[PDB]
UniProtKB/Swiss-Prot annotation:
Tissues expressed in: Ubiquitously expressed. Expressed at highest levels in adult heart, placenta, skeletal muscle, pancreas, spleen, thymus, prostate, testes, ovary and small intestine, and in fetal brain, lung, liver and kidney. Expressed in natural killer cells (at protein level).
Protein name: Disintegrin and metalloproteinase domain-containing protein 17
Factors inducing expression: In arthritis-affected cartilage.
Location of the Peptidase M12B domain: 8-259
Clinical condition linked: Inflammatory skin and bowel disease, neonatal, 1: A disorder characterized by inflammatory features with neonatal onset, involving the skin, hair, and gut. The skin lesions involve perioral and perianal erythema, psoriasiform erythroderma, with flares of erythema, scaling, and widespread pustules. Gastrointestinal symptoms include malabsorptive diarrhea that is exacerbated by intercurrent gastrointestinal infections. The hair is short or broken, and the eyelashes and eyebrows are wiry and disorganized.
Subcellular compartments: Cell membrane
Residues of the full protein shown: 216 to 477 of 824
Active-site residues, Swiss-Prot/TrEMBL: 191
PTM statement from Swiss-Prot or TrEMBL: The precursor is cleaved by a furin endopeptidase.
Gene: ADAM17
Disulfide bonds: 10-118, 150-254, 208-238
Domain-level remarks: Must be membrane anchored to cleave the different substrates. The cytoplasmic domain is not required for the this activity. Only the catalytic domain is essential to shed TNF and p75 TNFR. The conserved cysteine present in the cysteine-switch motif binds the catalytic zinc ion, thus inhibiting the enzyme. The dissociation of the cysteine from the zinc ion upon the activation-peptide release activates the enzyme.
Length: 266
């Protein structure tokens, strides 16, 4: 099983909510798309150059298919919620949503567009409790996988539609501060890594959680350790095992060819 050039790319829906647009894009479309285009490039760089078998099974990446920028809050009726509404949920005195509820709701609301891509990712700007930066559904090689890349849908009778949990989100706000772009690069790489089927690197396995004087942790380590060490922008063998099986299984199904189109999504 070696890479198919016509199926080596996971096409991505990128969504920026009004909070990201206002604070990170400074309320400019141009600034917003520039920031996201460059972040996905840097994330893709990590992925393409990763050899999941440590041999030559590499060149798998991600490419933006759509950048959906929501320029104001979603109008809502009493009772209703929407991942892009003005207030945070379920507690509107907090800066941020409950982050699990946010991913669930983003997944529900963005379902029509998520059905058309390998992954959908929300970019937002809020301070989640406990210093959380991202969250994503974990992929799997299982034929009946219901999360991450190329998942099976859950049907929503109330929504009269299929819901796909091929989703995740990143916040570039933490403890009231905008994070460094190189920190943001890592979080999104981490959240996408779950989608591709990796769990956290266990602090147990030293070869998957090397000490600082050993080159530092790999990207799927569940704490944002300060300073930049070599391993930070690499996938551990623990991650590589999981992600390799997942790709090998799912790429034929919903990966595409690398392209540089004039217009995406037509
Ligand atoms: C800098 C860097 C890096 C590696 O990426 C991370 C992403 C999310 C987190 S987190 O704090 O949000 N944690 C709770 C949920 C998520 S998926 C893991 C911690 C680290
Ligand atoms: Zn994680």
């Amino acid at each position: 099983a070696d890479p198919d050039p016509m199926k080596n790319t996971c096409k991505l829906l990128v969504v920026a909510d009004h909070r990201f647009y206002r604070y990170m894009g400074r309320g400019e479309e141009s600034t917003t798309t520039n920031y996201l285009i460059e972040l996905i490039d840097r994330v893709d760089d990590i992925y393409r150059n990763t050899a999941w078998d440590n041999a030559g099974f590499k060149g798998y990446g991600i490419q933006i298919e759509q950048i959906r920028i929501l320029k104001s809050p979603q109008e809502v009726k009493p009772g209703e919620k929407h991942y892009n509404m003005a207030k945070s949920y379920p507690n509107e005195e907090k800066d941020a949503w409950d982050v699990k509820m946010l991913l669930e709701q983003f997944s529900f609301d963005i379902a029509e567009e998520a059905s058309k891509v390998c992954l959908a990712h929300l970019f937002t700007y809020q301070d989640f409790d406990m210093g959380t930066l991202g969250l994503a559904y974990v992929g799997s090689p299982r034929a009946n996988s219901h999360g991450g890349v190329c998942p099976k849908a859950y049907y929503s009778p109330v929504g009269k539609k299929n819901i796909y949990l091929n989703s995740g989100l990143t916040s570039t706000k933490n403890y009231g501060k905008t994070i460094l772009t190189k920190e943001a690069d890592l979080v999104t790489t981490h959240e996408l890594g779950h989608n591709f089927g990796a769990e956290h690197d266990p602090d147990g396995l030293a070869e998957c959680a090397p000490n600082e004087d050993q080159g530092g942790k790999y990207v799927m380590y569940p704490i944002a350790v300060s300073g930049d060490h070599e391993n930070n922008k690499m996938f551990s063998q623990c991650s590589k095992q999981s992600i390799y099986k997942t790709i090998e299984s799912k790429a034929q199904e919903c990966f595409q060819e690398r392209s540089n189109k004039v217009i995406e999504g037509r």
